[PDB]
Paper text:
The bacterial sliding clamp is referred to as the β clamp, whereas the eukaryotic and archaeal sliding clamp protein is called the proliferative cell nuclear antigen ([name]). Clamps are constructed from either two (β) or three monomers ([name]) to yield a ring composed of six domains, which share similar protein folds. Hence, across every domain of life, the extraordinary efficacy of the replicative polymerase complex is dependent on their interaction with sliding clamps, which encircle DNA and greatly enhance their processivity. We have shown that PolD uses two distinct PIP-boxes for molecular recognition of [name], which are located in the C-terminal region of their DP2 subunit.
In the peripheral region of the complex, the DP2 KH domain, the DP1 OB domain, and some regions of the [name] were found to be flexible and the local resolution map ranged between 4.0 and 6.0 Å. In these regions, crystal structures of PolD DP1 (144–619) and DP2 (1–1050) individual subunits, and the structure of the [name] [name] (from this study using X-ray crystallography at 2.3 Å resolution) were used in model building. The structure of [name] in the complex is not distorted compared with the structure of free [name] and we conclude that the cryo-EM structure represents a stable interaction of DNA-bound PolD with a closed [name] clamp.
Numbering used by the authors:
A (entry chain A), B (entry chain A), C (entry chain A): -1 to 116, 127 to 247
């Protein structure tokens, strides 16, 4: 036997969206469940992007954890079960003595499923609205498979060049999209678009996205979960 | 020559939805047209489910039938024609002396198409909302190809078990989903999910669904058409 | 070097819709840019339909053209770039001394893309609402690959016949769909449905569509762009 737990989230469809949003690039993940909260850590199969989803105890209406354990489930089966959650439904994540996860969706009825279980020296920081960065990624995807990110003093540039076409998205603090731009020195880096597209899919104006990067080094993309939780991506630069 | 008729239905898109809803499992159907109403009878190609759609004269704004006949049309061509009907349009089903069905859609214009023509001893009864039974069927479809229906005194259970996963949907009269539960004895039966999915597709909260079943015997699923008409499915239990 | 220009359109998504609507049948097009406006001329690969899109200077918030030139771009890459334009965004079409088109989308940010650049004797006239003609084309597509257009004195008929099925859509000035019907003599002609479907895709009640045709001769289909511009199709009759 492993440690039992009962964890309740209000808004089953919103929770499915976090798990969907955090696991578009991955096939497997580890869930560290402690008294403080849940941590989901994963890497995509090409080991280019590290995912870290932190869900503290405070975002749950009920959080009964009297120990510590690391748990793995089939992520395809999990996403399919969570996709069954409706907008204002209650989500219950229960575990007993056995190696099984019990997932309840409370609404017009209670539907219970059972699943078997198993510091970078950054040069630039940018706080951007989620709709602007999702637009920019999509625009770059039309011309290339790589996207360049440039941070100058009070200016953030996104560019992509292909065999025939080019794209450029420039931003200053004057633009509605740029909330903050802290730059030590001129910073330029290029990243894969397949990875960026899955990180930015489903972002909007309500999303304050922090992007940290350096010269020829990884990008840290971060956005908050109800001002307590956090979804972080650490993305390797392109060769 | 066969007997002529003119039958008018108000709400062409709603009529297409009845025919779509009743014919998801079938490829051919017989339409018995009498002075009382229209009956559509069919069986799916595997002879596991019997469909019976009864549309009495009273749901039509015009019902001119001066005899009795059984008619068959290509169901694919019929569904495609009915799918052309808009929300508040008038549907006209006319037949003359010839073996042809004339289907008119009255709206921004009149669009006329011409088509060539050719007691179980139940132990349990359950009146359930259409949204709860559609949810339960979909949930079961994630883990298995068969679904078990259990009726106890004041409790209705839906369960499915696969190679790895399990699902359970429990209901009492306390639940908003359970309107009625009349049980003679404890009743358990299992049915194919492919069949159930097509029977419950498009059901919502406005739909009061009567499910009658017995131990190891067929299930009768029934829902009303404007409180006059009726769509009944008789589904064979799984081996 | 070729002549430079700057052309600004208010409503980027609406402009993408004109270019999408005008180029569903074509793969390449020539754009004649003069001081009066832009003309897009094209023919589909089977040379059955001629497209003529006229966009006068007056529909643009800025129209700086100090010469005359005929320009070609990859239409797939153009439609993909224009599809990035949002509802109330500003569209900027700029050209410098070089053989490149600069397309800017002004909104939550400025997103600049760079693209490399390269009298019939009619017998009948019909002014029809765009929703009625799109419905009629779709209805005919269910039974045949050809559609017959008939114009009598105060009556317009659309018919199609297949191997088994038939369709008929009749209209008089009494019908809401028929705004005008000017007929010299009884006019009958048949056209390919694949071509008609792309010409009528996206039309609604707000669209006053003029159809001019003759006996066994082409059809001219025309609709206005903000009461100034014009999209004309000249479609060859079917053999």
């Amino acid at each position: 036997g492993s440690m039992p737990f009962e964890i309740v989230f209000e808004g089953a469809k919103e929770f499915a969206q976090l798990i969907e949003t955090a696991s578009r690039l991955i096939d497997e993940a580890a869930f560290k469940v402690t008294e403080e909260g849940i941590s989901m850590r994963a890497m995509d199969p090409s080991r280019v992007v590290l995912i870290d989803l932190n869900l503290p105890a405070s975002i749950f209406s009920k959080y009964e954890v009297d120990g510590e354990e690391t748990i793995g489930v089939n992520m395809d089966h999990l996403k399919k079960v969570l996709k069954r959650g409706k907008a204002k439904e209650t989500l219950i994540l229960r575990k007993g003595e056995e190696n099984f996860l019990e997932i309840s969706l409370q609404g017009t009825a209670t539907r219970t499923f059972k699943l078997p279980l198993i510091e970078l020296p950054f040069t630039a920081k940018v706080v951007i609205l989620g709709d602007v960065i999702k637009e920019a990624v999509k625009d770059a995807s039309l011309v290339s498979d790589s996207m360049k990110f440039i941070a100058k003093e009070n200016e953030f540039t996104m560019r992509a060049e292909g065999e025939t076409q080019e794209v450029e998205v420039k931003l200053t603090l004057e633009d509605e999209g740029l909330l903050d731009i802290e730059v030590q020195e001129e910073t330029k880096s290029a990243y894969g678009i397949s990875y960026l597209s899955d990180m930015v899919k489903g972002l909007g104006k309500a999303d304050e996205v922090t992007i940290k990067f350096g010269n020829e080094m990884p990008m840290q993309m971060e956005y908050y979960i109800r001002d307590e939780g956090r979804l972080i991506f650490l993305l390797a630069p392109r060769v």
